[PDB]
Amino acid sequence: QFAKPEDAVKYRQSALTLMASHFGRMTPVVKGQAPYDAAQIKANVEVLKTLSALPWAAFGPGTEGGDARPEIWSDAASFKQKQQAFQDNIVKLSAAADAGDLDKLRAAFGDVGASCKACHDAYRKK
Amino acid sequence: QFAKPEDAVKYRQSALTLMASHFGRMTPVVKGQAPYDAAQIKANVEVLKTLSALPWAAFGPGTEGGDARPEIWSDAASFKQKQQAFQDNIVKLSAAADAGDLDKLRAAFGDVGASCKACHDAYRKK
Ligand code: HEC
Ligand code: HEC
Numbered sequence: 001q002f003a004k005p006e007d008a009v010k011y012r013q014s015a016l017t018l019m020a021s022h023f024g025r026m027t028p029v030v031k032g033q034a035p036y037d038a039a040q041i042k043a044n045v046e047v048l049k050t051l052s053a054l055p056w057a058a059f060g061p062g063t064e065g066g067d068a069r070p071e072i073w074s075d076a077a078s079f080k081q082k083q084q085a086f087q088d089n090i091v092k093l094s095a096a097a098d099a100g101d102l103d104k105l106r107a108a109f110g111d112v113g114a115s116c117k118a119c120h121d122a123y124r125k126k
Numbered sequence: 127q128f129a130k131p132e133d134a135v136k137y138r139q140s141a142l143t144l145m146a147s148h149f150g151r152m153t154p155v156v157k158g159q160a161p162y163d164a165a166q167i168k169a170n171v172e173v174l175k176t177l178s179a180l181p182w183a184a185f186g187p188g189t190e191g192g193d194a195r196p197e198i199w200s201d202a203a204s205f206k207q208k209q210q211a212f213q214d215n216i217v218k219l220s221a222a223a224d225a226g227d228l229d230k231l232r233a234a235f236g237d238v239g240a241s242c243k244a245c246h247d248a249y250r251k252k
Contacts, residue, residue, distance in 0.1 A: 001151040011147050014140035018180070020158050021137050025127040054144070 008063035015054040028107040038100035045097035066123040067125040086115040134189035141180040148174040153216040156232040164226035171223035
């Protein structure tokens with residue numbers, strides 16, 4: 001599916017756009033500005049869980065480009081920790097959504113949000 | 127998540143790009159040009175199943191734009207049949223992948239492929 005480095009860029013950008021939508025639409029619920037519907041959130045966090053695993057296979061060998069910094073590949077043990085933290089947080093998010101526990105959800109939502117930013121600060125271009 | 131019609135366009139384009147990748151990467155397997163690994167295909171068709179439900183919520187009221195024809199909304203009972211056929215085919219695809227049955231997979235892959243094209247012929251711009 002990633003014939004040239006550009007195809008990898010196009011895929012990973014599309015997956016990240018969809019995780020942003022699926023993550024970002026839950027903001028009003030975790031802030032108490034919308035009613036919490038536990039089954040709907042459980043379904044939406046299942047979509048997000050699936051989407052959250054996809055970008056990372058499109059950052060393989062030789063796929064520099066986009067708004068990706070080069071340090072993704074020159075500091076790859078570091079990048080990998082910034083991806084694992086984020087996928088670790090998605091596990092948390094799922095555990096709270098599956099339990100129907102809003103306070104835990106709200107907590108795991110903020111862990112997720114911070115890990116998004118920590119990777120962007122270090123490995124995404126302005 | 128779709129504040130303006132453009133946000134709906136951007137989301138639906140990203141979801142369709144990812145379904146194309148996840149659908150299109152199985153071509154060599156269904157054509158016998160790559161070995162069939164039933165568990166890996168089962169996992170990939172699970173990703174595709176999840177992705178295949180997403181575009182359609184971003185074609186709601188008042189989200190004309192992109193390479194979407196207007197007839198999506200002026201002939202909406204017709205568009206809806208072209209989406210149901212495609213989602214019906216994804217069910218088939220999943221049933222074969224979950225069974226590990228390559229011939230049925232290959233058949234359901236071609237039903238999927240045709241339904242992609244039938245909708246594009248009728249409701250996507252050149
Ligand atoms: C590294 C471990 C990252 C984590 C965790 C997250 N993102 Fe990110 N994101 C990353 C990179 C290197 C890039 C640029 C990709 C490129 O090749 O251009 C991005 C990009 C985005 C985008 C823009 C997509 C586009 O349309 O071009 C968005 C909307 C985005 N990222 C959102 C996002 C969110 C919401 C995350 C947590 C849920 C997140 N990213 C995590 C690197 C990393
Ligand atoms: C109608 C019922 C459709 C079915 C079934 C499929 N697609 Fe399609 N596709 C449709 C439209 C109306 C559009 C244009 C969207 C816009 O607003 O621009 C598309 C677009 C695509 C694209 C381009 C995405 C982009 O990057 O802009 C691709 C790669 C695509 N569609 C692929 C695709 C595949 C592989 C399908 C079956 C698995 C499929 N689409 C079904 C309408 C419909």
